[PDB]
Design a protein around this nucleic acid. Structure first.
Length: 1201
RNA sequence: AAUUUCUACUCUUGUAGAUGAGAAGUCAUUUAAUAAGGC
DNA sequence: GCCTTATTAAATGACTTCTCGAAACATG
DNA sequence: CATGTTTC
């Protein structure tokens, strides 16, 4: 062990602040809260405005850019046709090049546009990241109603709020590859999708040129990109035209299509036309089907609202809006009172001549399902009557023409009536009278009040439901005037349909307002009328930040001193609080140059002068600088000399060590001479010449700059200051701090007390950070109480392992050279089984199982059933227009305890944990929180200074930088591929070698049976043996030969005495053996002599008997047999091991997996043994990349045979 | 049925575990409605 | 009844970037 | 000059 203090972790603590004495009253009198929330409100108001600034500028820039994307296209193509570290790097660096080109356009050093406009853009940018935005001078250049500027100097003199915001906006414009940057989105996101789209287009054309023309006029029909050929919109320079959002939109529409007001025919986009073409199911459609069919739409451009040429409804504001406008609509519809004339039309149609009543072909199938048994029944009742009416000889060709004649033509009413009989008629009449009655019902019943509560919403949903149902019913009949219709009928039928369309609009608007989220009050930011509030903690500018701390006998206190004086310390244990004293020097990388080399005066003198310059201000011993140092940190070159990138370009380390050596010497000069840090005793630091890379030096320098001292003040003084109003005191408090709580505390409270413990204050494994904020949340054995009062919340960050390195240096290789050193440690592994969501496993290094568990239920609570009920209730809520609700809190309380004992008997077994890398939200969440808990591990009982305590944590996982860059192995957690863990009998280490999609027709089934050597009956044992050599049936197989070259249905009993049938297989569950005990007696084949049965069935060549035999071999070869109703998930093995045992998980032997999922987890963990046993097998190295199925599959067997 | 907050609890005016916050952005998915089709 | 492709709205969920600062500077 | 702002 000893894995601790490897890399720092930063966490955030939350507390409640309780005002003391007049403090709370003071806030009321000052009304800080109203101004604070008011400023928050104004911030939400102000954001989209300033965002219009950023957006407009980015738009101008991106309009200007035209690049040649071919080099990038090659960099991708050259990535994989064949890909290695070389092609990967080369592509990363050309990605870099294109990114940096766009960013060049942004900052105005690009070579492309003229230098005057370049200067314009640069000036604009430099203005774009600071309070300059609010002055409005920056807005002046770009091409501001009286409201916005009022908000603008509402935040004037306060702008440092938006300080945070500034960074985010820089994150949009950065040239670094970061998902949130525009250049990234253009280079790495959109352009590859574009290029692939060009590919799809080109392949499709070289296969099907007709399609090209279709594409052209599809583009003609959508009206997009009229000036440009279809072949050009798939050229790369067009992707130059694709950088603005408006263009991205238009593109994605030419793929997607335009949809205007509901009920009207939709305009088809390319993807649609392709899909329809495929569903035409001819030779062509077969071809397209073989090719890629679906163009990829581009991602949204950062920061900018999407646009559409399609239709969007007018929003519904509130209750009175929806109900008043709806009620007006319905009372209008009853004022027309031709809901009566709909019934009049249905009686009319059962009276009038029926052949003139026509039904749309599109609606016919829905008709058949509604009024009749199934859709099939009406459509092919029509079919066989139309066939019966065919003349003379009948060709299948004719029957085909029948089918497409039904799909392309409307039907008279007595055609369907006479085809399906009169059972359909009064089915019709019955549904008719129903849909009308319901409609009439909803027209009478009034509308409620407001919609505030659900049942109130329910009558609305129902009424709209039945109105809309009448609309559908009316929508059944043939629209076109081409069809022959009794003029009165069709005339006022289209009349009442026109009457019923606003019900469609009302339905959708109503759904959209109703299903909106309900209002909730939550926390807002308290800065107490200073913009720098709780920026950072230390001494000089506490006066500026107004925030200090206090401790009394274990009580914590946040003091906050809004501005318009000082505090006097005394000896300890005289009636008073101990106040923290903080002195801190933020990271000297940023800072030392700021306070020494980068001063405006230093620069200004140095462009003029060579002669060095001493500076006397905030320096005990005057500190001088020389051209060598100043230009050392400002080369007028891209790389800094002492950082390694310079070392790669310059390839000469001698000079580089000289550079970083004298730079470090300068840092120590400064420190020894700087007012704050001259007092700090640096003796611990190694000789300056020694350090290999500068970053380490900076990390070892930086902790000695953080000191937490403490001094007791007296409580009469600041009782007076509190009751004055000069100082606002809150108790930092939580549940563990109240009273009459002693059970063990929460982990964050241990972080806190331990943070301020005397031993940590001695020297620090944990540190207090700035950036803390204050919060006010208004209200909404009594629960939710904490939300029914107005309360103050305190957010402070802390850091763990301060002394430790910023990022783990080479964590995983050594992290198990620890596993290199003891193969003894067992292996935990995990599968997410569908039957039971989490399943664990623990296997001995020798390969013998220890424990098998399910976590469906923990702490005598089933979380699987609670979840199951919860998501059922969810979808019920969404189809009912009920508030959906959040499952995340439940999910992670469950997974909270799961994490708890997972790491607990990870510890007690001192083992490596192994997970599965690819329903699945629960899994991915699971190992997220697991990785997080193993980045920092603390045990509540342990003493602080002992490893595992609040001062010394365990870290078993490489730092989580992100999920995408995760290698298979992180720290002790090892990722492994899922496949074949699930489906493999453990004893056998055997599978179905083949996909069953290649055994399709009768010839291939015959060949498949001719690949097997023999099939005969064993008289002694009573079961059948089928021998197969893995070198046969190579055309059917999945290409996994593995290692080996080549059940009587009984009533067995488990360890508990429960009966089950041997060899039973499973929706549908049935035994394959007893038919072959029938099938062979149906064909009269003699199997009881041990005779080979296969040549008799193949020489007999019965089609049905051979298909049934292949289906039997199918069912035997399926090991996982599961039916949810029975609760059966089991593994039964088709082959017998060398010990003469057919494994069945229904025997319930604990030495072996109890259910399919248990076997799943079991080989998952065992594969980890295979991996760390491979690098046990090869001396030294670094963990293996991936497992191939072929390498895994072989393995078990030698081990197992 | 009490919480910085979550989940689970109640011999205990509380109990066991968990808990990286804030800001910004993006993507995915569900449901409904609609359009053209497939079965 | 189910499904494909697409558009619209409402919803939840999940991922990815940055900050976690005292002191220099400037504005009036 | 004091303090919000911008810095490296």
């Amino acid at each position: 062990e000893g894995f601790t203090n490897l890399y720092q972790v930063s966490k955030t603590l939350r507390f409640e602040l309780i005002p003391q004495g007049k403090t709370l009253k003071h806030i009321q009198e000052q009304g800080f809260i109203e101004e604070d929330k008011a400023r928050n409100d104004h911030y939400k108001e102000l954001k989209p405005i300033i965002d219009r600034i950023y957006k407009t500028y980015a738009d101008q820039c991106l309009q200007l850019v035209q690049l040649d994307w071919e080099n990038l296209s090659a960099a991708i193509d050259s990535y994989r046709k064949e890909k290695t570290e070389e092609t990967r790097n080369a592509l990363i660096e050309e990605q870099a090049t294109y990114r940096n080109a766009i960013h060049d356009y942004f900052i105005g050093r690009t070579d492309n546009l003229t230098d005057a406009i370049n200067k314009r853009h640069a000036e604009i940018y430099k203005g774009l990241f600071k309070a300059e935005l609010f002055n409005g001078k920056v807005l002046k250049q770009l091409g501001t109603t009286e409201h916005e500027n009022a908000l603008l100097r509402s935040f004037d003199k306060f702008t440092t709020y938006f300080s945070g915001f500034y960074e985010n906006r820089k994150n949009v414009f950065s040239a670094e590859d970061i998902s949130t940057a525009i250049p990234h989105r253009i280079v790495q996101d959109n352009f590859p999708k574009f290029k692939e789209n060009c590919h799809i287009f080109t392949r499709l054309i070289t296969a099907v040129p007709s399609l090209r023309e279709h594409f052209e006029n599809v583009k003609k029909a959508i009206g997009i990109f009229v000036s440009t050929s279809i072949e050009e919109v798939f050229s790369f320079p067009f992707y130059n035209q694709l950088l603005t959002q408006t263009q991205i939109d238009l593109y994605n529409q030419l793929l997607g299509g335009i949809s205007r007001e509901a009920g009207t025919e939709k305009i088809k986009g390319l993807n649609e036309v392709l899909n329809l073409a495929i569903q035409k199911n001819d030779e062509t459609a077969h071809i397209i089907a073989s090719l890629p069919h679906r163009f990829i739409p581009l991602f949204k451009q950062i920061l900018s609202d999407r646009n559409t040429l399609s239709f969007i409804l007018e929003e519904f504001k509130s209750d009175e809006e929806v109900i008043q406008s709806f009620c007006k609509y319905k009372t209008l519809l009853r004022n027309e009172n031709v809901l009566e004339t709909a019934e009049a039309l249905f009686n009319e149609l059962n009276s009038i001549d029926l052949t003139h009543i026509f039904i749309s072909h599109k609606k016919l199938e829905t008709i058949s399902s509604a009024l009749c048994d199934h859709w099939d029944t009406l459509r092919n009742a029509l079919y066989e009557r139309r066939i019966s009416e065919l003349t003379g000889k009948i060709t299948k060709s004719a029957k085909e023409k029948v089918q497409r004649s039904l799909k392309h033509e409307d039907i008279n009413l007595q055609e369907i009536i006479s085809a399906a009989g009169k059972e359909l008629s009064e089915a019709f009449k019955q549904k008719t009278s129903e849909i009308l009655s319901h409609a009439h019902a909803a027209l009478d019943q009034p509308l409620p009040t407001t919609l505030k509560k659900q049942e109130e919403k329910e009558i609305l949903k129902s009424q709209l439901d039945s109105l809309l149902g009448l609309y559908h019913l009316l929508d059944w009949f043939a629209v076109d005037e081409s069809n022959e219709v009794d003029p009165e009928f069709s005339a006022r039928l289209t009349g009442i349909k026109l009457e019923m369309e606003p019900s469609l609009s009302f339905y959708n608007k109503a759904r959209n307002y109703a299903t909106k989220k309900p209002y909730s009050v939550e926390k807002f930011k308290l800065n107490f009328q200073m913009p720098t509030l709780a920026s950072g903690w230390d001494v000089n500018k506490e006066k500026n930040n107004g925030a200090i701390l206090f401790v009394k006998n274990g009580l914590y206190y946040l003091g906050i001193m809004p501005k318009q004086l000082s505090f006097e310390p005394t000896e300890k244990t005289s009636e008073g609080f101990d106040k923290m004293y903080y002195d801190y020097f933020p990271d000297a990388a940023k800072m030392i140059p700021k306070c020494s080399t980068q001063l405006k005066a230093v620069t200004a003198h140095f462009q003029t002068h060579t002669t060095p310059i001493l500076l006397s201000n905030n320096f005990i011993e005057p500190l001088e600088i020389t051209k060598e140092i100043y230009d050392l940190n400002n080369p007028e070159k891209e790389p800094k000399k002492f950082q390694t990138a310079y070392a790669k370009k310059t390839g000469d380390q001698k000079g580089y060590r000289e550079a970083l050596c004298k730079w470090i010497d300068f840092t120590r000069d400064f420190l020894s001479k700087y007012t704050k840090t001259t007092s700090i005793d640096l003796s611990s630091l190694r000789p300056s010449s020694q350090y290999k890379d500068l970053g380490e030096y900076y990390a070892e320098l930086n902790p000695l700059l953080y000191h937490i001292s403490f001094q007791r003040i007296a409580e009469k003084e600041i009782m007076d200051a509190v009751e004055t109003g000069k100082l606002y005191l809150f108790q930092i408090y939580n549940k563990d701090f109240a009273k009459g709580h002693h059970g063990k505390p929460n982990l964050h409270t241990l972080y806190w007390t331990g943070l301020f413990s005397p031993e940590n204050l001695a020297k620090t494994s944990i540190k207090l950070n700035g950036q803390a904020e204050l919060f006010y949340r208004p209200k909404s054995i009594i629960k939710d109480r904490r939300f029914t009062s107005d309360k103050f919340f305190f957010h402070v960050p802390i850091t763990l392992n301060y002394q430790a390195a910023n990022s783990p240096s080479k964590f995983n290789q050594r992290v198990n050279a620890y596993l290199k050193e003891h193969p003894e440690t067992p292996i935990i592994g995990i599968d997410r089984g569908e039957r039971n969501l989490i399943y664990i496993t623990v296997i001995d290094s020798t390969g013998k199982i220890l424990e098998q568990r399910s976590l469906n239920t923990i702490q005598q609570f089933d979380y699987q059933k609670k979840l199951d009920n919860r998501e059922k209730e969810r979808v019920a809520a969404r189809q009912a227009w009920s508030v959906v609700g959040t499952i995340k809190d439940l999910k992670q309380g469950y997974l909270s305890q799961v994490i708890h004992e997972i790491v607990d008997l990870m510890i007690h077994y001192q083992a490596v944990v192994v997970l599965a890398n690819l329903e699945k939200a629960v899994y991915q969440q699971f190992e997220k929180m697991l990785i997080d808990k193993l980045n920092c591990l603390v045990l509540k009982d342990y003493p602080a200074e002992k490893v595992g305590g609040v001062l010394n944590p365990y870290q078993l996982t490489d730092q989580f930088t992100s999920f995408a860059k995760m290698g298979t192995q992180s720290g002790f957690l090892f990722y492994v591929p899922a496949p074949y863990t699930s489906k493999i009998d453990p004893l056998t280490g055997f599978v179905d070698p083949f996909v069953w999609k290649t055994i399709k027709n009768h010839e291939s089934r015959k060949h498949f049976l001719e690949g097997f050597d023999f099939l005969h009956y064993d008289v002694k044992t009573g079961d059948f043996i089928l021998h197969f050599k893995m070198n046969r049936n190579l055309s059917f197989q999945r290409g996994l030969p593995g290692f080996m070259p080549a059940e009587k249905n009984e009533t067995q009993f488990d360890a508990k005495g429960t009966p089950f049938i041997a060899g039973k297989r499973i929706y549908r569950d049935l035994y394959p053996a007893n038919e072959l005990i029938a099938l062979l007696e149906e064909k009269g084949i003699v199997f009881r002599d041990g005779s080979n049965i296969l040549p008799k069935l193949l020489e007999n060549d019965d089609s049905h008997a051979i298909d049934t035999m292949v289906a039997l071999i199918r069912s035997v070869l399926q090991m996982r047999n599961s039916n949810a109703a029975t609760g059966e998930d089991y593994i039964n093995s088709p082959v017998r091991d060398l010990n003469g045992v057919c494994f069945d998980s229904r025997f319930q032997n604990p030495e072996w997996p109890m259910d399919a999922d248990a076997n799943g987890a079991y080989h998952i963990a065992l594969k980890g043994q295979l991996l760390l046993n491979h690098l046990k097998e090869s001396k030294d190295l670094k963990l293996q990349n991936g497992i191939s199925n072929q390498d895994w599959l072989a393995y078990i067997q030698e081990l197992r045979n």
